[PDB]
A paper describes a structure:
Both Sirt2–SirReal2 crystals belonged to different monoclinic space groups and contained one monomer per asymmetric unit. Our structures feature a completely new and unexpected Sirt2 conformation, where SirReal2 functions as a ‘molecular wedge’ that traps Sirt2 in the open conformation even in the presence of an acetyl-lysine peptide substrate. We call this a ‘locked open’ state. The position of SirReal2 in the EC-site of Sirt2 is very similar in both structures with either NAD+ or the acetyl-lysine peptide substrate (r.m.s.d. of 0.47 Å), and we will primarily describe the binding of SirReal2 in the presence of NAD+, as this structure likely represents the SirReal2-inhibited form of the enzyme. Structural comparison of the available Sirt2 structures with the Sirt2–SirReal2–H3 complex can be found in Supplementary Fig. 3. Surprisingly, this rearrangement does not prevent Sirt2 from binding its acetyl-lysine peptide substrate, but deacetylation and the domain closure is blocked effectively. The hydrophobic acetyl-lysine–binding tunnel is not formed in all Sirt2–SirReal structures, since Phe235, which usually caps the acetyl-lysine, is rotated ~90° towards the surface. Further thermal stability experiments indicated an additional stabilization of the Sirt2–SirReal2 complex in the presence of either NAD+ or a peptidic acetyl-lysine substrate. These findings were the key to a successful crystallization of Sirt2 in complex with SirReal2 that was only achieved in the presence of either substrate or cosubstrate.
NAD+-dependent protein deacylases (sirtuins) constitute a unique class of enzymes that are conserved from bacteria to humans. The human isotype Sirtuin 2 (Sirt2) deacetylates both nuclear and cytoplasmatic proteins and thereby functions as a major cell cycle regulator, a determinant of myelination, a regulator of autophagy and a suppressor of brain inflammation. In this work, we present the first crystal structures of Sirt2 in complex with a potent and Sirt2-selective small-molecule inhibitor with drug-like properties.
Author numbering: 56 to 106, 109 to 298, 306 to 356
């Protein structure tokens, strides 16, 4: 009774091009941006937090109340970690193709780098589960003046603590600090989207950070779930208690292990989309390289 004829990338592609598959939800994380030269900010082994701030504890750099009273460490770190270029990956442009072809219901992302937007996903297509640098707001509840990334970038590089032009309050990028809630939009969209989904495409996430990881359990029981990731992820934790790729009871979950770009390339090829994807990426990359 299962929807995939076989538990392979080939099976997923046949399903995608069948009448049964109309709405795809993508769940994406840091693994879709590493090939764009953006490291994984949640990892301690990427050396981003290797080093004067006098933090009452090392975690305070991520905490909202600390930020509000001592914003300088955050903004110094933001300058240090600011990417040299913003060129979305093959994986990002694969999602743009999903959008173009009327298959994209939603992209839920853990990333803050804005590459989904640069690749042409719109606000309505996105749930930025950990917020984004794309916009920043004055922290004063009575004001909330919104500032674009161009404005915020200028403040970060000039090492001027960003203050609101209307009220002189601190201006904070719309990323979710420890102590802040996840965006309201995350919960709203989750409630509706997973009633409507035909395929989950899970790319570049290890599914270890909650509540993002729990999204896979919101899929209907029949909905195929394809993981494209360097490592297998999402199975039940044998210590406590999921994806089932390999047991005799597996029926809908498929793992393609490798670089996300290569997995998306392989899937696009099966779909007859490889030329379209190559043409889109090369054109967009050229346009970004040519920014004058
Ligand atoms: C600075 C910048 C600007 C743009 C457009 N894109 C990037 S992507 C590269 C990157 O990893 N950067 C980062 N900026 C801040 C980081 C740590 C951090 C600290 C405190 C709170 C956090 C709240 C939520 C998330 C992280 C938080 S990592 N980086
Ligand atoms: Zn203000």
């Amino acid at each position: 009774e299962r929807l995939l004829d076989e538990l392979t990338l080939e099976g997923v592609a046949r399903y995608m091009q069948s009448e049964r598959c109309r709405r795809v939800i993508c769940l994406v994380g840091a693994g879709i941006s590493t090939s764009a030269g953006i490291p994984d900010f949640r990892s301690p082994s990427t050396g981003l937090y290797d080093n004067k701030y006098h933090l009452p504890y090392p975690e305070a750099i991520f905490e909202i109340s600390y930020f509000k009273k001592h914003p300088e460490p955050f903004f110094a770190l933001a300058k240090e970690l600011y990417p040299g270029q913003f060129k979305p990956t093959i994986c990002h442009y694969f999602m743009r193709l999903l959008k173009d072809k009327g298959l994209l219901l939603r992209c839920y992302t853990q990333n803050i780098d804005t590459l989904e937007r640069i690749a042409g996903l719109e606000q309505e297509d996105l749930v930025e589960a950990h917020g984004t640098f794309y916009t920043s707001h004055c922290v004063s509840a009575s004001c909330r003046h919104e500032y674009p990334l161009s404005w915020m970038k200028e403040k970060i590089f000039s090492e001027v603590t960003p203050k609101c032009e209307d009220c002189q309050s601190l201006v904070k990028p719309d990323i979710v600090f420890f102590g802040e809630s996840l965006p309201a939009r995350f919960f709203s969209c989750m409630q509706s989207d997973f009633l409507k989904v035909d395929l989950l495409l899970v790319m570049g996430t290890s599914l270890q950070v909650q509540p993002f990881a729990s999204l896979i359990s919101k899929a209907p029981l029949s909905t195929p779930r394809l993981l494209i990731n360097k490592e297998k992820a999402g199975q039940s934790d044998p210590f406590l208690g999921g994806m089932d790729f390999d047991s005799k009871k597996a029926y809908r979950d498929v793992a393609w292990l490798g670089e996300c770009d290569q997995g998306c390339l392989a899937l696009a090829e099966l779909l007859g989309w490889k030329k379209e994807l190559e043409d889109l990426v090369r054109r967009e990359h050229a346009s970004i390289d040519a920014q004058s």
